[PDB]
Amino acid sequence: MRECISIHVGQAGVQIGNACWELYCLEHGIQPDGQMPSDKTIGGGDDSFNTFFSETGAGKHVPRAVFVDLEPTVIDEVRTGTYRQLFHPEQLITGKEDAANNYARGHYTIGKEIIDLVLDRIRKLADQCTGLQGFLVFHSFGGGTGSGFTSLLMERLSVDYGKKSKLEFSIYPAPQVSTAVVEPYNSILTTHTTLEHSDCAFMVDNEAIYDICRRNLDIERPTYTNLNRLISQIVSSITASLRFDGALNVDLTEFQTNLVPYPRIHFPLATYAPVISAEKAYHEQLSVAEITNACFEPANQMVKCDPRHGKYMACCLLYRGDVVPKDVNAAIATIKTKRSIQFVDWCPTGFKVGINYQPPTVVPGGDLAKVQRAVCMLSNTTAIAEAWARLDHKFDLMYAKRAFVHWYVGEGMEEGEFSEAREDMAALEKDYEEVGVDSV
């Protein structure tokens, strides 16, 4: 019951998907051949982990997932990799020619050749569900598949599944690892197209993640495998409430209720702690009180925003591991005293907390220390709009001279589609401003 289907679109989407499902397997004691010695309910089950994993006769626990890409290189590595046996081939879907960093190719020219097949396979997963919660969609803002095909799929999923929840994990572009000059363009287009089809979207700023890998893990020049391993921990935190349960556990949909005041204001800010090396973590254990404080240090934010110059509309704390109510309560009391934390006048100021006792694990040869307890804060702050602004400025500079616009028109798009996407983005920044204003 309450199953959740993950959809991993494009390179970023797929590679992050790898990290995530490896980690989930390590969290639930699932081997790379799908077998799970803990599960005595053979062939079936009602357990918490069954919302992300189906079971088979052989005793094999199978990710409720689909990996889609318009080119086979990245998914091919999955097909041949450590966790090859974990999936069924019908779940790994590849084209031949990618979208060449072109939204238009992803949404139309190449995407249309494969959208039906993907939906057919998504549908086949939905049929295994007693009661589907919704979908999780992992994608890059910048790629052509990540942007264009994702918009197409999301639109198609709105139609085929009506209003079943659709959550995004969107990789926001950073210059230190950008692959295309036109990623601002692709970003604004997918964001606009997906906006009214997405219930809730967790933006991951790569510059933020690159920053944290450099600073807290002393990684000299972070790789994708570096960012992904950190990103996976964060996703794991957010999905923990869906995959585990205990008395103190609060369902993600409950956090969602607090976090989204209006259907367009559905972009929460993630801040995670502790991110700490094994060298620093040795002999130094971090308290409930200590990790809670980190959540309000912008260095630990997942998007480069400044919540201090913005107003709060909500605060959630997703604790996992060795955390007790008593300590959490005292911890928040501190921060209520030691910080200022302005809320808008129309929202209350209570923090919705959830706790999963199941402690964070780490992937072998990871760079992250194996901690006893950890926390992810989900905040709805006006400051998240800063992310749109930086991207909207980058977009503006190029479209002024119609730079690169011709690779898009040639695939079938119009200038009208651009100006339109950009107007939605302007409205969204305006919207994110309107909510910060005080009432009368």
Binding site: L248, P325, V328, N329, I332, G350, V353, I355
Partner: peptide
């Protein structure tokens, strides 16, 4: 506020 029967 964290508050279980």
């Amino acid at each position: 506020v964290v508050x279980x029967f």
